[PDB]
């Protein structure tokens, strides 16, 4: 019902402040290295379970994608243990920001593109809990 759906969907939002706090990080190395980052230690960011919060148990940065993880203790069933993901492409003065359902990118260095991920049994964030502002598919432009 609405009491839960609003609980969940505030949690998120902590999972995606938390994984905002990267961004700068992320794009420094990009352009510094013309490549995108494949861990959070070569990205400059702290570990990635030291990247947590009330509701968040860890963000992992690979290949430049930015991933939160939920916690599992006290939030809501729907959203225990699952993901979200931003990430980022070129637009060549700056870079635009995409947030929904978690993706990978294969490679660290292609248009920026990035898929869906194939991890099997998913744990993706519903759409229903995402905010307005993070439900990107992973071939948005
Ligand atoms: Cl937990």
Same mark, same amino acid.
């Given at each position: 019902?609405?009491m839960q759906? =609003?609980? *969940? ?6 999972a995606?402040?938390? /994984?905002?706090?990267?961004?700068? /990080?992320?794009?420094? =190395? =990009? ?9 959070? &230690?070569? *990205?400059?960011? $702290? &570990?990635?379970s030291?990247?947590?919060? +009330? =509701? ?5 940065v690979?290949?430049?994608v930015?991933?939160?993880?939920? $916690?599992?203790?006290? @939030?809501?069933?729907?959203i ?14 700056? @870079?635009?920001?995409? %947030?929904?359902?978690? @993706?990978?990118?294969? +490679? ?7 898929? $869906?991920?194939?991890? /099997? ?12 502002? %993070?439900?990107? *598919?992973?071939? $948005?432009?």
């Open positions: 019902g609405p759906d =609003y609980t *969940a969907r505030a949690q998120v939002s902590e995606i402040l938390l /994984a905002e706090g990267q961004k700068s /990080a992320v794009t420094e =190395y =990009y352009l510094n290295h013309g490549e995108w980052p494949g861990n959070n &230690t070569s *990205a400059g960011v $702290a &570990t990635s030291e990247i947590k919060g +009330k =509701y968040v148990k860890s963000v992992e690979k290949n430049g930015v991933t939160a993880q939920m $916690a599992s203790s006290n @939030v809501n069933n729907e225990k243990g699952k993901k979200l993901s931003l990430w980022a492409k070129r637009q060549n003065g700056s @870079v635009k920001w995409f %947030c929904g359902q978690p @993706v990978t990118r294969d +490679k660290a260095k292609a248009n920026d593109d990035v898929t $869906a991920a194939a991890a /099997a049994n998913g744990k993706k964030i519903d759409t229903k809990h995402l905010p307005s502002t %993070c439900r990107d *598919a992973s071939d $948005a432009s």
